């Protein structure tokens, strides 16, 4: 809640929203999901993969 809302005049570099009403802005939930992308069934030859 400190780095995502910037007041009028402050540096909006890492911010998300910026405005006059940014002192009272709150997050509620920041649910996330991670997906791994890989290659399966590696071609085992002699002495392993």
């Amino acid at each position: 809640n400190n780095t995502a809302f910037a007041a009028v005049g402050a540096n909006p570099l890492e911010a998300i929203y910026q405005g006059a009403g940014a002192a009272d802005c709150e997050f509620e939930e920041i649910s996330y999901t991670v997906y791994q992308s890989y290659l399966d069934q590696l071609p085992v030859g002699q002495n392993g993969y």
């Binding site: 399966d40 069934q41 590696l42 085992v44 993969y49």
Partner: protein
């Protein structure tokens, strides 16, 4: 290589006043014994290093291992019953 004038010749040099003969003779200057003074130190804290340097940097490596290799659950093909 001058040519002798026969009408007005001249003779050799005549004596003239002289420059007080001992005052053209120098003394032989008399050196005393000398010494490079002090006890010299053996080494000096030099402002530059005395060894070679390298113009370019080369990337170095070290070997690593992988891990214990496991088995797998392959998706297995269908049977060649004359459709394939």
């Amino acid at each position: 290589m001058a040519l002798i004038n026969p009408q007005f010749p001249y003779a050799g040099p005549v004596p003239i006043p002289g420059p007080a003969p001992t005052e053209t003779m120098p003394l032989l200057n008399y050196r005393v014994e000398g010494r490079i003074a002090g006890i010299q130190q053996a080494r000096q804290f030099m402002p530059f290093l005395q060894g070679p340097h390298r113009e370019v940097a080369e990337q170095t490596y070290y070997a690593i291992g992988t891990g214990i290799q496991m088995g797998q659950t392959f998706n297995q093909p269908l049977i060649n019953t004359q459709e394939g």
